[PDB]
From Swiss-Prot, chain A:
Glycosylation site positions: N29, N69, N200, N226, N308, N354, N376, N396, N449, N502
Origin species: Homo sapiens
Entire-sequence positions represented here: 62 to 608 of 1078
Effect of mutating G82E: In HHC1; decreased G-protein coupled receptor signaling pathway
Effect listed in the UniProt record for changing R459K: In NSHPT; decreased G-protein coupled receptor signaling pathway; does not affect cell membrane localization
Phenotype for T90M: In HYPOC1; increased G-protein coupled receptor signaling pathway
Compartment(s) of residence: Cell membrane
Protein name, per record: Extracellular calcium-sensing receptor
Length: 516, 122, 61
């Protein structure tokens, strides 16, 4: 399958490099080149590309006693921008940190990549996923649910996030009914089992840590069986996916609530996008297939070459916000700013031994990694970009809802709130419930408790084998009273007092004697 | 630190190879060699060893638009015995299954290595 | 026996208290989540472990 969003990200990287080349202030008299390959969301292709990257660092490899030979035409990669998947990023990071080649990702958000005892050279322009799990827990607690389900992808991205959500939820007295694992290559039996598990539960809310390509089979099967009335909490990976936000799935995945990254501004980017042409793009070899898939031609009718990009509606230009593309832009500019900081080193202020400075004409990868570890620069919009001791860049979240389009009939992503990761714990979530349309049409918050709350005059009772959230209430006995809702036990009245007929309160006893 | 148990395991592999070579029934007229490296329970060391293993297939890589050649007498490993840790085995399995080189582990027991979509030759 | 289990808030189901059954109900066995309201013409022991047939009262010869 062809991904136009990925080609847009590649174009964003190329645009950033060209803009830096045009700028005289950044890296005077120095030109940046690039070598870009396709991973296809697969570890094998990314590993072949990484081998091509490190073909020149492998010359002085101690593991071989003999001497290897590589042609001088092979260049030396100084830094890498990639990749999207966390497993792919881990596989690439192993080889890259073997040779201390810095790697700056734009979409990988697994917490496992924060461990620096394994991933020596790894940096990110996307925030870690602890805050996203905490925010999902905060949302669930805010809307007063306690009985939910969980789905996750069987990879380095879904599992840590689902574990963090599990612990945060059990901290907040939230009970999880089921927990299943799905993959892009799950057999029909596995999908059927997960769908059956979803059916057998009574929990409306379901939390999913997955991506579009991995969630697609499950969504397809659920739509095939018409399992409606479910509330989906999406993570940033698939909250704005074009594979799940398809209108004929709406009756299943309408009213979905999800997370999005803060967008950014790249002036002149759309103009660069619209100038793509298979023949003019000689450096960019991915333009040919992009054109063929855009206009359904083969350069099946042939390609005249005079077609207009705007004639076809694709994610290449049919977009509103730039979030991951801004991450790619920031990655390229961070590498460029590290190189610039190398280029302007004062003789007695270097980061190296005895305050020595590097030479930009013969700069090395580990020096650029050192300068990236101590980077501090200002964005185009005017914000400061630094990485922590683990190479992370923390940022806000926007909470969005999946609505319907009255005109086109497509799916709209309205903004219903925000999660401020900088505020104190407990004062970070904000939601305008007046805009949320549950299931896409409803205006009342759905009910997702295991059992109904029980009113005054009763007390909870254990149902054997079921969690704390599930209980059966028994009426209070004579003499005791219950003046609270959802009480663990009936309180007892003081002396000279006796229970009402309702046992909500208790009155004073009467006194009987022969009176005048 | 020094691991005597690991040295015993290495000796077991060498003993098995030598007993195969001495026997006339299993693989007559064919001799088995070996190239055995130390991992120090770390991914980096094992990855260097695996690069040594697959240098020939690096010569046979397809991504590089320009050819690269190494020493001819560098042996091509048929199969790999190892490794102990599961993360080490995962990384080594990625690199080896890139080239369809069988890898038989002796102490890696994680379920994540039961995926034949990601680990083809494990 | 004689006492039923009670829910402790903010703790799992494995952690519970237990309280004596009301007069009129009993708990014959342990690990009891409820006290049985045992049938007509029967009341409870002083220890609420079983049921005793009610005494019939009338003027006797
Ligand atoms: C994350 O979001 C919060 C709230 O949306 C931002 O805090 C606001 O910052 C602006 C200035 O940029 C102030 O005018 C508002 O009063 C702030 N709102 C508060 C404190 O509730 C915060 O700056 C964002 N973080 C970023 C952009 O990094
Ligand atoms: C579902 O269960 C939750 C328990 O977590 C209920 O939330 C409670 O709501 C009452 C409302 O008065 C609050 O006083 C409690 O503090 C809440 N408990 C919490 C936040 O742990 C929720 O009300 C239940 N659902 C319904 C419909 O009652
Ligand atoms: O770590 C990962 O695999 C996910 C992948 C991912 C994220 N956001 C995305 C948007 C589009 C496509 C893919 C993604 C978050 N990090
Ligand atoms: O997969 C793993 O990590 C473990 C490592 C391991 C196992 N048994 C051992 C005995 C000695 C030393 C290490 C091990 C079981 N598989
Ligand atoms: C769902 O419930 C039915 C009815 O008890 C049962 O037969 C079936 O095995 C259950 N399936 C799953 C996946 O729990
Ligand atoms: C699926 O369910 C929706 C809502 O209940 C209904 O409008 C639609 O007709 C159903 N479609 C099929 C094929 O059952
Ligand atoms: C980064 O630079 C800004 C100046 O724009 C400064 O205010 C800030 O304190 C610096 N941060 C660090 C961590 O050095
Ligand atoms: C007891 O409950 C009944 C039924 O709702 C109600 O009419 C009566 O007022 C209650 N008695 C109180 C609250 O004292
Ligand atoms: C009631 O149970 C108690 C145990 O706590 C026992 O000592 C007592 O004899 C019992 N009374 C009966 C069986 O009448
Ligand atoms: Ca990728
Ligand atoms: Ca997508
Ligand atoms: Ca059970
Ligand atoms: Ca032999
Ligand atoms: Ca090992
Ligand atoms: Ca607790």
């Amino acid at each position: 399958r062809y991904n136009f969003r990925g080609f847009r990200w590649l174009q964003a990287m190329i645009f950033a490099i060209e803009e830096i080349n045009s700028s005289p202030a950044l890296l005077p008299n120095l030109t940046l080149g690039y070598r870009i390959f396709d991973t296809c969301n697969t570890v094998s292709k990314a590993l072949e590309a990484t081998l091509s990257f490190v073909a020149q660092n492998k010359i002085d490899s101690l593991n071989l006693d003999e001497f290897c030979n590589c042609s001088e035409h092979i260049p030396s990669t100084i830094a890498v921008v990639g990749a999207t998947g966390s497993g792919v990023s881990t596989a690439v990071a192993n080889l890259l940190g073997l040779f201390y080649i810095p790697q700056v990702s734009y979409a990988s958000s697994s917490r496992l990549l924060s461990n620096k005892n394994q991933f020596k050279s790894f940096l990110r322009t996307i925030p870690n996923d602890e805050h996203q799990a905490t925010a999902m827990a905060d949302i669930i607690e805010y809307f007063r649910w306690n009985w939910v389900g969980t789905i996750a992808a069987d990879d380095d991205y879904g599992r840590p996030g689902i574990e963090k959500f599990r612990e945060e939820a059990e901290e907040r007295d939230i009970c999880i009914d089921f927990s299943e694992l799905i993959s892009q290559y799950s057999d029909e039996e596995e999908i059927q089992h997960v769908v059956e598990v979803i059916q057998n539960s009574t929990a409306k809310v379901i939390v999913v840590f997955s991506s579009g390509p991995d969630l697609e089979p499950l969504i397809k099967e659920i739509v095939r069986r018409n399992i409606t009335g479910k509330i989906w909490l999406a993570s940033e990976a698939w909250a704005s996916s074009s594979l799940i936000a398809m209108p004929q799935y709406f009756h299943v995945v309408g009213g979905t609530i999800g997370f999005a990254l803060k967008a950014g501004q790249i002036p002149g980017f759309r103009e660069f996008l619209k100038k793509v042409h298979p023949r003019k793009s000689v450096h960019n070899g991915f333009a040919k297939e992009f054109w063929e898939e855009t206009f359904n031609c083969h350069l099946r009718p042939l390609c005249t070459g005079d077609e207009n990009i705007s004639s076809v509606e694709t994610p290449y230009i049919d977009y509103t916000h730039l979030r991951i593309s801004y991450n790619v832009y920031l990655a390229v500019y961070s590498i460029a700013h590290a190189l610039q900081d190398i280029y302007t080193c004062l003789p007695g202020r270097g980061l190296f031994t005895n305050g020595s400075c590097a030479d930009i004409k013969k700069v090395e990868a580990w020096q650029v990694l050192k300068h990236l570890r101590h980077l501090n620069f200002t964005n185009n919009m005017g914000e400061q970009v630094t990485f922590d001791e683990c190479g992370d860049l923390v940022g806000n979240y926007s909470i969005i809802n999946w609505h319907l389009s009255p005109e086109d009939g497509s799916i709209v992503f309205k903004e219903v709130g925000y999660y401020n990761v900088y505020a104190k714990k407990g004062e970070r979530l904000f939601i305008n419930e007046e805009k949320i349309l549950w299931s896409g049409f409803s205006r009342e918050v759905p009910f997702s408790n295991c059992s109904r709350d029980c009113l005054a005059g009763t007390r909870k009772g254990i149902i054997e084998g079921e969690p704390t959230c599930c209980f059966e209430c028994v009426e209070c006995p004579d003499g005791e009273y219950s003046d609270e809702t959802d009480a663990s036990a009936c309180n007892k009245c003081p002396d000279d007092f006796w229970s009402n007929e309702n046992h909500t309160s208790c009155i004073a006893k009467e006194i009987e004697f022969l009176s005048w």
